[PDB]
Design a protein around this ligand. Sequence first.
Ligand SMILES: *C(=O)c1ccc(NC(=N)N)cc1
Length: 245
Amino acid sequence: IIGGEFTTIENQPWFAAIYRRHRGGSVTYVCGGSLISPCWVISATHCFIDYPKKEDYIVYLGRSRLNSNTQGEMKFEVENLILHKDYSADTLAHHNDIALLKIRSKEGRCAQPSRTIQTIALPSMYNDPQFGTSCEITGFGKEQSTDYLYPEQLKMTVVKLISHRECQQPHYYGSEVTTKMLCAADPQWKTDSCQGDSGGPLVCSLQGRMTLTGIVSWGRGCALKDKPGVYTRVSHFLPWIRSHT
Ligand SMILES: *C(=O)c1ccc(NC(=N)N)cc1
C-alpha cells in the first residue's frame, strides 16, 4: 500500500495472508485474499500461475503482521487451488485475474469466526457503487515502488472508483481495461495498491453493507499520475464463483 495508514486485522477481519513454501522449507509472502465463506478464500490467479501446486501454499487468517504470529491467528493448508481457466496476461493487463483457495487446517477444519476472523459479503450480480465512491484496499504490499522490503504491519488506504469511460482514455490504459475490470485511484494519485497487495480486497459499502467489490489485480507502477489501480470486477464473476464453490 502506497501512503494510507497502518491497521490491525480487527479492521479487515476477512483479510487472508497467503505464503509459499520454497523447496528447502523457506516461506515467503505471495499475495492477499478475502474469506468469502468458512472454507473459501478468494484471490488473484496471477499470484499462483508460476507455482500452481496447492501443496506449496499456506493461508493465515486473523494475521496483522507479515513475519510474526498474531495472537488468535489460524493457519490453513490449501485443499483446492482453483485458477480461472480463461486467465490471460499481456505486458500489464491481467484478464479473469480471480482464484479460489479451499482452506483446511491440519485438524481438517475451515475458518472459525472470531473478533479477528470474519467473512466478507459478495456483491449482487453487476451491482457496483457509482464512480467517485470511496472504497478501501488492504495489504502487506510495498509502501514505495522502490522499496525492496514489504511492511511488517498490515496497511489500508482509501481509493475512489473511476468510470470505464475515464479509465479507457488515451493517457490512462486505453483498451487494456475491459468491463470485467474496475479502476480506482486517489484524486492526487498519492495512495495506491503496489507489488504484494494483489489478490487482496477492494471493499465498498453498498446499500449499507461492506461488499467485496474488487480484487487487487494490476496497474502501471504504483501511485503514478493517470495510472489507476485495476481490480477484478467481482460482480461480473458470480457464475464462476457459484460453479466452483
Ligand atoms: C498486485 O500485486 C498489484 C496490483 C496493482 C499494482 N499497481 C497499481 N495499483 N498501480 C501493483 C501490484
